[PDB]
Amino acid sequence: GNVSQEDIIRALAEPLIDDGMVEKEFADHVIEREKQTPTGLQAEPVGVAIPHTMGEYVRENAISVGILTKPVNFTGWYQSEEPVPVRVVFMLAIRNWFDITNVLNWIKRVIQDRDFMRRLLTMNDEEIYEEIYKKIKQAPNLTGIHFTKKYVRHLN
Amino acid sequence: EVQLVESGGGLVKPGGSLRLSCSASGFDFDNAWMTWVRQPPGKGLEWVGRITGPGEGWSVDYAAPVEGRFTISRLNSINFLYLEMNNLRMEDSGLYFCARTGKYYDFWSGYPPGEEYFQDWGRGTLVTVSSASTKGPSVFPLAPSAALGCLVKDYFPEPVTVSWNSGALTSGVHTFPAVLQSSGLYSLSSVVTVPSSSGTQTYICNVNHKPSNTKVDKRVEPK
Amino acid sequence: YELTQETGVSVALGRTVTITCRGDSLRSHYASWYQKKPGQAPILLFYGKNNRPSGVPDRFSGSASGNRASLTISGAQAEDDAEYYCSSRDKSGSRLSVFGGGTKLTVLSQPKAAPSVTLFPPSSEELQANKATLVCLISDFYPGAVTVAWSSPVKAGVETTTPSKQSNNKYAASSYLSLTPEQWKSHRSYSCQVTHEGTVEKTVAPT
Ligand SMILES: *[C@@H]1O[C@H](CO)[C@@H](O)[C@H](O)[C@H]1NC(C)=O
């Protein structure tokens, strides 16, 4: 009866739905893709997940970020016969495969800093907003994206 | 499962135009990336261009030689891929395939924009660009001096059909792959090995050329 | 070629062979591999880090290192006798794609067979049409490595076909030497010398 994959994705998508960045159906397709193309990435402090479609049902590029106090199993992006305990989730709403690849490459650099992840595990919605907002600013050649404080949410 | 049929290739002259088409079934065509590839006679695969999907605005990327002369397009309501070719040259002749194109980007070690691979191909459509118009063949006997044969000279266009003993269905007959001559014409040879004794052999070869409506028989003799 | 491949490579039945593709883009981009047989559609074999499509035999495997991508066949078979192409981006960060030159893989699956050679003098009908052509017809050789040479070691106006497999699964080729009817009488004689595995020669006289 603890948090389940569908809940995080639906939770994360709600402000994107509410703000018009993706279509209303968008979460159900993220969930389908997670069954088919899992996005669980083992990392230093805690596990990471990047639920995303390949651009379907996305209307303006946006991101929503979710922090989990208790870990949740997401099947690994790479095959390991070992589920990934996730506490950080990056929901991607990107339309262009070209733009996609840039954003996941930027995603990687963020994950490699473990103390940032340790910080994000104990930080406020406002703190994670302006911290992430800055990293988007400090990211070069990154496409235009949409990030608001509502896009930051604690879960579970 | 996946089926890709190409169509539209054929005989065309320099400076001419041609529209190629590819019909797709068995997969999500409307959202797939589709690629044209060509292989010149004797030469290797060469990437022509690629059309993306709806998220990418159906943008098309072109190899530098064909940029400005070929246009790639699609009609997703009938699952058709098109290559419209203008200002064709001999240098553009060869066999053209459509490929279904996947997208690959490894997270930890990949570098954008990823890599594209070609998971399903068609059998292809042949586009021939020459100045050779059309040509019915010249046939000459190759008398024994036991191998006896016929020589087919200076035709255009391919192909060419042979027959021995007037459709006799004789075995021991080997038809050699033609050679595109330097003048741009084709020449071929067909030989059959026969008993060194069996005087009343009565050997006459038959070559038919449907493109020219040409039919000839050669009563090749020892001589 | 941003991507460079061995022109051709040979191997024995059941033995292991590796084909390589070299280029600067391969230091930042993975490569995919395709098998191409005469008259047949290319078959995707391998792509990415360790991606082998369902249906490709496990004897096919890929690897990358530095500026070098490579494909390996473990227990080569006669069906693997084919042409092999790599593909990747041209430059780092490019939306365009390129193919390598290709590698002809010869799986030596058959006992060596010497070529059978027939040389035909120009026919009288062609001569009465003021033309001449000598015809060399090479057949039933394995493997398909023939060079044809036409007693003066000089030869001009030659046109030779690419080797081609027969129903016997041996190979055949043909070489055509054009001449004018006066040249055939002008020269002492013309000769067809063909080399297969280091040389059966045949000659024809203006008679
Ligand atoms: C994840 O799955 C493993 C399966 O062995 C299980 O032991 C573990 O308790 C699971 N954890 C969560 C948070 O679901």
Numbering used by the authors:
A (entry chain C): 3 to 158
B (entry chain A): 1 to 52, 52A, 52B, 52C, 53 to 82, 82A, 82B, 82C, ...
C (entry chain B): 2 to 9, 11 to 95, 95A, 95B, 95C, 96 to 106, 106A, 107 to 148, ...
Q: What is the paper's account of this structure, in its own sentences?
A:
We developed germline-targeting epitope scaffolds with affinity for 10E8-class precursors and engineered nanoparticles for multivalent display. To assess the structural mimicry of the MPER helix within the epitope scaffold and the interaction of the epitope scaffold with the 10E8-class D gene YxFW motif, we determined three crystal structures and one cryoelectron microscopy (cryo-EM) structure of 10E8-GT epitope scaffolds complexed with 10E8-class human antibodies.
To determine whether 10E8-GT nanoparticle immunization selected for 10E8-class BCRs that bound to more native-like immunogens, we tested binding of post-prime antibodies to an epitope scaffold (10E8-B1) with a 10E8 peptide epitope that was fully native, except for one mutation required for solubility (W680N, Hxb2 numbering). 10E8-B1 had no detectable affinity for early 10E8 lineage members but had increasing affinity for artificial intermediate 10E8 lineage members with three or more mutations and ultrahigh affinity (Kd = 80 pM) for mature 10E8. 10E8-B1 bound to 10% of 10E8-class antibodies induced by 10E8-GT nanoparticles, including 10E8-GT10 12mer or 10E8-GT12 24mer in hD3-3/JH6 mice, and to 25% of 10E8-class antibodies primed by 10E8-GT10 12mer in macaques. Thus, 10E8-GT nanoparticle immunization selects for affinity maturation that confers affinity for an antigen with a more native-like 10E8 epitope.
